[PDB]
Symmetry: D2
Amino acid sequence: HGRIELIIGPMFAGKTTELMRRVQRHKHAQRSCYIIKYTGLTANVSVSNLHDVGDEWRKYDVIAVDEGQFFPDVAAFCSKAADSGKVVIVSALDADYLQEPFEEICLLVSRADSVVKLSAVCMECHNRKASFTYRTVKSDERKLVGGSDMYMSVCRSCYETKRNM
Amino acid sequence: HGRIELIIGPMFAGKTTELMRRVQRHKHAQRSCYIIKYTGLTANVSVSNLHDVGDEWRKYDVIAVDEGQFFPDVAAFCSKAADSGKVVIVSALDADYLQEPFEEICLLVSRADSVVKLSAVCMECHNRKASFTYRTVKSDERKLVGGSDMYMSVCRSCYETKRNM
Amino acid sequence: AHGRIELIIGPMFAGKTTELMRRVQRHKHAQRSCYIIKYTGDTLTANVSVSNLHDVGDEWRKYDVIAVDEGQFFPDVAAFCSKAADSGKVVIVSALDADYLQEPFEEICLLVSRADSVVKLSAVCMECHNRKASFTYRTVKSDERKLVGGSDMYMSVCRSCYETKRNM
Amino acid sequence: AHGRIELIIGPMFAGKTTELMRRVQRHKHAQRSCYIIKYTGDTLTANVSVSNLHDVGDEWRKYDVIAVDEGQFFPDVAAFCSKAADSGKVVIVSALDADYLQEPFEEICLLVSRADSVVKLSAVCMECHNRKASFTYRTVKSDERKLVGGSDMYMSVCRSCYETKRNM
Ligand SMILES: CC1CN([C@H]2C[C@H](O)[C@@H](COP(=O)(O)O)O2)C(=O)NC1=O
Ligand SMILES: CC1CN([C@H]2C[C@H](O)[C@@H](COP(=O)(O)O)O2)C(=O)NC1=O
Ligand SMILES: CC1CN([C@H]2C[C@H](O)[C@@H](COP(=O)(O)O)O2)C(=O)NC1=O
Ligand SMILES: CC1CN([C@H]2C[C@H](O)[C@@H](COP(=O)(O)O)O2)C(=O)NC1=O
Ligand SMILES: [Mg+2]
Ligand SMILES: [Mg+2]
Ligand SMILES: [Zn+2]
Ligand SMILES: [Zn+2]
Ligand SMILES: [Zn+2]
Ligand SMILES: [Zn+2]
């Protein structure tokens, strides 16, 4: 019946586009899809906790979760949904800007049927595949919502190089 | 320097979405991308022959070709571009509605650095992964432009079942 | 029931046969019966060496999973695979997609269109040692399309090394 | 120069060690020097069996490519891999991501965040023989987290078989 599919990788890797590619496939076969997004045949919702969705998710064949790393209870939610027979698809960062794991996404790795880690292109050297997200502005807040203004995806050596200067 | 990446699979598998996912990645690293589409940092063109693009493609780092199976000279074009150092990305059907290969895309398989075959979800049984495109209207024209009105993506056994009734 | 065709392609030295046997082993842990077909001129589950698939007869019907190694040597491979997958077998094929001139094996091209799954593996360039390799370069002088051998006669190369070497 | 960490995860019987050796062999065809590290309690390129990575010393610096099998047994694996990849090695690790209770090996979770590449393989469900399997079920009674063994003590299962069996 149910499964969990997980899409990880650094920023700018196209994780959300891949999540939607998959949702679309299911829609062409007349499956009902429920898309959950974060905020500080089809359906959408922006929420800050998966609790706040209630039981609405049970009306759907496929549940998609975007920015899974911002939801504190995401692993338990996905397991509950997959145990009820849903196809659960999650896009998330695996690593924060210090290359430290989001603990909840780690738990999802252990529970997932499928895991794909996408890469980006290094925004520093423009020559290599990038697996890390470097924060270009000086906060020590773990969560800090932003775009290419505040983050770059970089290859391993550019991450190091920048970490010096 | 150059490569060729090929994305294949039946209709409704999200090949064009994957092609664009990849283009977008390159754009975030400030690479210039040139997108070619068929008709009967960025740039677009609809054309019916790759000849009609001329040498415009040389101004770009990345060349993307959508619906590669409609272009008669696509293999030679891609090889020329990759030999000049371009990253060439092609989305195409590998098989026609009779499960017979597009000969030019076969040639691209042999020349590609990378090949991915995406699947769809079976639009007949809604239960299995689909690798074939079944034409639901009665032409014997190989080329016949259309959507879900005239085609379904199906699994192997649904393809057979329908081929009877 | 649910037959399928899985195809593994790529140049020589890419590990295609290893990937094939990885997949077989998975099935074997679940007690699936697996039959492995190799090519006769080529130099423990149920195994046979044949020079065409017709010489296997109907023996393949006794198995859940049929694995075909060096598929490019068999002239009737597409039809065999389709017949087996229509009978409900999982059919797994390892094959070169391209010959040493980068021209396709036509029968494998047919298989691409019939496959549920296609993976193209790469090797590491054996000329420059720096890039992924997608082509096989023949290092001995023969114009015979078929010429069985190993790293004594072939090497896998990246796109620019293939060109460079072709000038010599 | 261009170091990286490649991680192969999935449950038991998924072929992770075979995939690791597939990758090593590719590198070896391009004459890269490859070093293979196995776990000591565990039951030909340069090979060593150790119970932690610190006991390899600096021997790993003599190779282009470092392969670590059963990474979940090594307590210092993330740091070792990062140090090696920062020195320019290609580091390839095979490991269970989850234990028999479906709880993560924390050190492997760290590696996911540090890896350039992560692949999670599946097995075939050894209970129902019909579905892909992502979990390892321990078939003997031990509450020790670490318990070395094979199909004598474990089987890989799909999500519903894991549940079903857990009731017994
Ligand atoms: C690396 C990051 C990213 N972020 C943010 C930046 C973006 O708003 C978001 C990433 O979007 P993504 O999952 O890649 O579509 O998470 C953090 O809050 N903390 C970190 O350490
Ligand atoms: C299976 C097909 C499809 N087509 C068409 C239908 C669509 O216009 C197009 C597929 O779009 P795609 O590459 O999957 O984005 O090709 C044919 O002309 N002949 C065939 O035999
Ligand atoms: C590239 C090749 C390889 N071969 C042979 C050499 C080997 O015997 C066999 C290996 O292919 P494999 O990668 O094992 O499936 O194919 C040819 O006969 N003609 C060619 O053009
Ligand atoms: C699931 C396991 C497996 N193991 C052991 C059993 C095997 O010796 C080893 C195999 O893992 P592999 O798939 O080879 O990397 O890991 C545990 O010690 N604890 C568990 O919870
Ligand atoms: Mg082989
Ligand atoms: Mg192993
Ligand atoms: Zn870089
Ligand atoms: Zn179907
Ligand atoms: Zn080379
Ligand atoms: Zn099962």
